[PDB]
Amino acid sequence: GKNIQVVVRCRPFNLAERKASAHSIVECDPVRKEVSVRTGGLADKSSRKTYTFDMVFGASTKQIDVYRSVVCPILDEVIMGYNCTIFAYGQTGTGKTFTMEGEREYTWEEVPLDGIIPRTLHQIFEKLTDNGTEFSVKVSLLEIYNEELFDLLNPSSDSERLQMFDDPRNKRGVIIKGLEEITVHNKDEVYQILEKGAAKRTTAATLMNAYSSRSHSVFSVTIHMKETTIDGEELVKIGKLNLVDLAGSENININQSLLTLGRVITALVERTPHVPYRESKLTRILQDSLGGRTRTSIIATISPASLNLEETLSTLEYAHRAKNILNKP
Ligand SMILES: Nc1ncnc2c1ncn2[C@@H]1O[C@H](COP(=O)(O)OP(=O)(O)O)[C@@H](O)[C@H]1O
Ligand SMILES: [Ca+2]
Ligand SMILES: [Cl-]
Ligand SMILES: [Cl-]
Ligand SMILES: [Cl-]
Ligand SMILES: [Cl-]
Ligand SMILES: [Cl-]
Ligand SMILES: [Cl-]
Ligand SMILES: [Cl-]
Ligand SMILES: [Cl-]
Ligand SMILES: [Cl-]
Ligand SMILES: [Cl-]
Ligand SMILES: [Co+2]
Ligand SMILES: [Co+2]
Ligand SMILES: [Co+2]
Ligand SMILES: [Co+2]
Ligand SMILES: [Co+2]
């Protein structure tokens, strides 16, 4: 699977983990692209399990580093008119959202702590403006909670589950009816769009108890591009990027949707003819991207802490089952 990259990002051990008297049980090796965990736990030390992936981000890794390495070559493809997807997958609290969104002249914000989504909107605007491309950008943001779809961007949207239909004009496509798409007018409008997104998600975790923790959220960008050549020829392209912050790993039943995604990715990597797209909402919505000429990436997040051993081992196993990479001698 040249086209499907699986990478691992170990976040810093944290304060809560110290106070529980946890210790680091995971060793990352960016050069050998390995992650080792002592599976025995504490005094085992005979129990070391090692995994190999496309990339392993050690401690020195910053937000820009994940961006240049995972995202930039995918936006290249998106800008050439392809449809791509990037997943963040892992235990709650391990960095899926920090990676996808991150945190905030830069006066009130920490741009170094910006994640994938705002950096993506920035490059889109910077690259397309520089090369003289006439363009327009729109985004939708939806969440999936217990197999029901909710629009995070509808101002008047109460509650209401959106409805998804097959699209008989495309056998791989899908139509989410009523889905709001904002037009993005500048680099910084993303921040306000993520704000509106969060307010709304917060509401729905009250009147609903759909915790962003237990939900998938799908942030989709569509770019309409027109290039004019030397002679005044017009070249028209439509790119699409899906940035997905998955439901927490920990119970591995949105548990079933995660697993379906796993089989979908494994069938793609292995080229087996049976690809179970229809078995979850997430994979139906995404079949268009995953199934064509494309690039796909999973950022598997983990905590280094001994207290997280089981969920960390499971996340590693999931990512390994996804794209199986033999360990080096
Ligand atoms: N690579 C990282 N570096 C520094 N802090 C991080 C990193 N990843 C996560 N955190 C912090 O850890 C907490 C959990 O991260 P978050 O992305 O919300 O987890 P998840 O989305 O996987 O539940 C957040 O407070 C975040 O600020
Ligand atoms: Ca660490
Ligand atoms: Cl380490
Ligand atoms: Cl690390
Ligand atoms: Cl960091
Ligand atoms: Cl600039
Ligand atoms: Cl607008
Ligand atoms: Cl605007
Ligand atoms: Cl506005
Ligand atoms: Cl199946
Ligand atoms: Cl089945
Ligand atoms: Cl295995
Ligand atoms: Co480039
Ligand atoms: Co420039
Ligand atoms: Co500029
Ligand atoms: Co589902
Ligand atoms: Co049908």
UniProtKB/Swiss-Prot annotation:
Record's signal peptide: none
Sequence positions that bind ATP: 90-97
PTM (free text): A subset of this protein primarily localized at the spindle pole is phosphorylated by NEK6 during mitosis; phosphorylation is required for mitotic function.
Entry-annotated residues carrying N6-acetyllysine: 127
Domain Kinesin motor: 3-325
Cellular localisation: Cytoplasm; Cytoplasm, Cytoskeleton, Spindle pole
Disease: Microcephaly with or without chorioretinopathy, lymphedema, or impaired intellectual development: An autosomal dominant disorder that involves an overlapping but variable spectrum of central nervous system and ocular developmental anomalies. Microcephaly ranges from mild to severe and is often associated with mild to moderate developmental delay and a characteristic facial phenotype with upslanting palpebral fissures, broad nose with rounded tip, long philtrum with thin upper lip, prominent chin, and prominent ears.
The family this protein is said to belong to: Belongs to the TRAFAC class myosin-kinesin ATPase superfamily. Kinesin family. BimC subfamily.
Primary role: Motor protein required for establishing a bipolar spindle and thus contributing to chromosome congression during mitosis. Required in non-mitotic cells for transport of secretory proteins from the Golgi complex to the cell surface.
Oligomer and partners: Interacts with the thyroid hormone receptor in the presence of thyroid hormone. Component of a large chromatin remodeling complex, at least composed of MYSM1, PCAF, RBM10 and KIF11/TRIP5. Interacts (via C-terminus) with the kinase NEK6 in both interphase and mitosis. Interacts with RARRES1 and AGBL2. Interacts with TPX2.
Protein name: Kinesin-like protein KIF11
Upper classification of the organism: Eukaryota, Metazoa, Chordata, Craniata, Vertebrata
Encoding gene (name): KIF11
